[PDB]
Ligand binder design. Sequence first.
Ligand SMILES: COc1cc(N)ccc1-c1ccc2c(-c3nc4c(N5CCN(C)CC5)cccc4[nH]3)n[nH]c2c1
Ligand SMILES: COc1cc(N)ccc1-c1ccc2c(-c3nc4c(N5CCN(C)CC5)cccc4[nH]3)n[nH]c2c1
Length: 273
Amino acid sequence: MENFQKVEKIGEGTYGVVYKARNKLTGEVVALKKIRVPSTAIREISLLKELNHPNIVKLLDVIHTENKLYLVFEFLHQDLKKFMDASALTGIPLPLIKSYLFQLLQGLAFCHSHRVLHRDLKPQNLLINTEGAIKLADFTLWYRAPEILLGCKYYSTAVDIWSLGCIFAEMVTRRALFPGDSEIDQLFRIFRTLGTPDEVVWPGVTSMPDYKPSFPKWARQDFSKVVPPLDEDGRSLLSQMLHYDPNKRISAKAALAHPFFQDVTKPVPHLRL
Ligand SMILES: COc1cc(N)ccc1-c1ccc2c(-c3nc4c(N5CCN(C)CC5)cccc4[nH]3)n[nH]c2c1
Ligand SMILES: COc1cc(N)ccc1-c1ccc2c(-c3nc4c(N5CCN(C)CC5)cccc4[nH]3)n[nH]c2c1
């Protein structure tokens, strides 16, 4: 760590504080996470160093010293949450929403092809640069897939597609799709929009660990009401990302081929830094 000069505290993460720092050896400005250590951890994290892709924030170095673990990452200057908040009066233009969605699907398609899932996508860990890029980082209950909320412990890559669908909707409407403040409030916010799931639409749902037959029965709403002026291609894609049954939920790879991306481009955002 004497090889790192802390510049400022970036965040108070899930497993430790994150600082903007300078690597004194290379001169590079990096994001440094101090984890608050298991050997099983070292090996798992050491693998993620290899997982390199333009839409995944790079793990540059893993430093294990004095029974402490420091993870050093590529640094980006802004997160999607900040940008969403800054774009709130006007909205993010559709071409940039589409670009960001496309890129995140590429990142996910890459990760998922290596059997690695994110598990906790949210605007706060999606990072953007001045080039029009958006990147997955860390690779709130608002973005949690229903199978996680229903107690499935062996969930799949589909959980990330759900979270991204929630983020897509939020970019479009400038409001969170399912802003729950408890696990059951989250689940019931989902049910009140998409309908209480049953064995017809989600085979196996009634045997999920935390499923209760006493769940109230709500009817499904029209997507046109849920994500207004989003066009039919967008709503079609969103509907497939938000399928209850994780086995019917669209994959990242299939999503990339959806007609919504027929005219995708890569605009440059206006970033105030
Ligand atoms: C801001 O850095 C960049 C900006 C841009 N735009 C482009 C490239 C880079 C860049 C720079 C360095 C590196 C290294 C690297 N160098 C060293 C090292 N050197 C450092 C040089 N010298 C004093 C002797 C000791 C010592 C130990 C580990 C190292 N790893 N790998 N990849 C790099 C990429
Ligand atoms: C464990 O962290 C990781 C794990 C993995 N596996 C992969 C990546 C990362 C990672 C995380 C963050 C960053 C950043 C960065 N974050 C911010 C930032 N924050 C404040 C608001 N919010 C709460 C978060 C965003 C605000 C301004 C500038 C920033 N730059 N650069 N690189 C990172 C790499």
